Amino acid sequence: PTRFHKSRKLRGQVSMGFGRVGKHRVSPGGHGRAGGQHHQRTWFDRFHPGYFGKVGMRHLHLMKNRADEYEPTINVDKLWTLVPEEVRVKAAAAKKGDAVPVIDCVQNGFFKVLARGELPKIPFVVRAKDFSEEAEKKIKAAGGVCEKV
């Protein structure tokens, strides 16, 4: 607060840490983003290149609850994080038979699946909307199923 400021120690000093010859004044450059193509261009060119101009295709009436914009992603390395850890320990000790647990991505808010890392060799079933090529490949290789919705 007001005690700890540098302004408080600069009593006596006549300019308060702002120069004699220049004189600290309200409008040096011009207001806000002004002179971006003229006299403050060096700042724009140096720090924020590509600022000026128009690119892309105009999108009218964009909504983000559509299943065109809205795809949350999850990765193959996990999935097992969605289920609690007592489940998959029982699923490890099993024959080629029955009781293969369904990891529902869509309940938890994850539509697509994306293979960035490994799995174990447990059987399981991924219910999701979509997959990648390599994510579908890795789930087969572990020994499990790729359901669509």
């Binding site: 403050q40 720090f47 600022y51 559509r66 809205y70 369904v102 579908e136």
Partner: protein
């Protein structure tokens, strides 16, 4: 503009400083709300204050298909199935909504069972007497959605499928359809 900071984006060019709205009301506002709903529940007695009863209802868009919330009111179809009088059921403490008619068969079976649990232990005050105001947040509140696993048996018709070749060669079939009509004309 100076240094490495991001472009100066402050929406403060209008005279905002005349149109200020400070919220020092908030805890006094809380009591004006709170003292109203106590002066309600005494006047409403012997009827239950947490009511009126409202339906369970699925939310619309793709990213809330999971969740289920409280609606506005039950349909005239759902009341008559449960055993109620559509017009009179407003005054029995059940909210009614004539408009909604996109609710499919699964969510009707909830809301019929919801009204039956109400109509099972609704009772009526006679003439002279007075009855104790039985509050019950368990009945009116929605049941929380959860599923644990639903583990199931493996098909052994999985390696038959490959989804990615089914996806891509539907698109590559569609691409050649347009390019034939463009080329031939």
């Amino acid at each position: 503009v100076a240094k490495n900071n991001q472009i100066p984006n402050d929406h403060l060019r209008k005279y905002w400083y005349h149109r200020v709205k400070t919220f020092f009301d908030d805890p006094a506002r809380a009591q004006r709300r709170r003292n109203a709903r106590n002066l309600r529940a005494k006047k409403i007695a012997p009827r239950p204050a947490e009511g009126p009863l409202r339906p369970i209802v699925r939310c619309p868009t793709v990213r809330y298909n999971m969740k289920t919330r409280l609606g506005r009111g039950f349909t005239p179809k759902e009341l008559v199935a449960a055993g109620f009088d559509p017009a009179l059921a407003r005054f029995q403490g059940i909210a009614v909504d004539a408009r909604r008619a996109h609710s499919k068969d699964a969510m009707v079976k909830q809301n019929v069972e919801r009204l039956q649990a109400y109509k099972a232990r609704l009772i009526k005050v006679k003439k002279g007497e007075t009855v104790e105001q039985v509050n019950d947040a368990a009945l009116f509140a929605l049941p929380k959605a959860q599923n644990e696993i639903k583990f199931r048996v493996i098909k052994a018709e999985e390696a038959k499928k490959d989804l990615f070749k089914e996806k891509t060669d539907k698109l590559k079939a569609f691409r050649e359809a347009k390019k034939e009509k463009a080329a031939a004309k």
